[PDB]
């Protein structure tokens, strides 16, 4: 019961960080599109990613 | 003359406040289709909507940009992005462009005056200052421009942040 509620917390804390440094990086990817005044995302960028 | 009347005339509509304290800190302004406060000041924006709004903020850029309520479209500050070199003008007089680089003689600004935007021939706003570095007779201005899409920070050594 130690071993799989060990290995269970090692898997989630894995994918919670994973998948929070990869929003972390689109966030960082697409925030210099928004301040620029006018403008627009190209529709590539703005399909790979979901740009608003 | 006319020129500064016309710049005091849009600036009373365009620049709103940043209060704290029972002082005035920072100056945010509202280009385009957004709205740009430089984030390294902290205080309550004077306007009842304007701070009611979310913003969405970058400390690399040194910066916020907001999105504008529907009912201050009309108060537009038509933004541009063409830097000829030469003289522009500015609320604490003309600055020159050179060389990559800003330049206003020798103290023209104060320290806290962060936020101005500049405006060219036309009055449409090139970038805004955020800090400024001494050097002889002369300062250079650490500001932020919007060539294309991005926004581009330009810094000299020795910069002091305003």
New interface residues.
């Given amino acids: 019961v130690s071993a799989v509620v060990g290995m269970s917390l090692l898997a989630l804390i894995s994918i919670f960080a994973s998948c929070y440094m990869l929003v972390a990086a689109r966030s960082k990817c697409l925030?210099?599109?928004?301040?620029?005044?006018?403008?627009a995302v190209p529709w590539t960028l703005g399909i790979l990613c979901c740009a608003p | 003359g006319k020129r500064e009347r016309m710049c005091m005339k849009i600036e009373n509509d365009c620049i709103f406040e940043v209060k704290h304290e029972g002082k005035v800190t920072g100056y945010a302004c509202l280009v385009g289709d957004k709205v740009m406060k430089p984030a390294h000041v902290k205080g309550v924006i004077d306007n009842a909507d304007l701070a009611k709004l979310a913003f969405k903020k970058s400390s690399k850029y040194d910066l916020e940009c907001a999105q504008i309520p529907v009912h201050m479209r009309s108060d537009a500050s038509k933004y541009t992005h063409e830097k000829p070199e030469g003289h522009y003008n500015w609320h604490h007089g003309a600055v020159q462009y050179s060389g990559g680089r800003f330049t206003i003689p020798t103290g023209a600004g104060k320290p806290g005056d962060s936020g101005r935007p500049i405006f060219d021939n036309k009055g449409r706003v090139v970038a805004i200052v955020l800090g400024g570095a001494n050097e002889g007779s002369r300062t250079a201005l650490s500001v932020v421009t919007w060539n294309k899409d991005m926004v581009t920070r330009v810094t000299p050594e020795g910069s002091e942040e305003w």
């Fill in positions: 925030t210099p599109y928004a301040l620029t005044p006018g403008a």
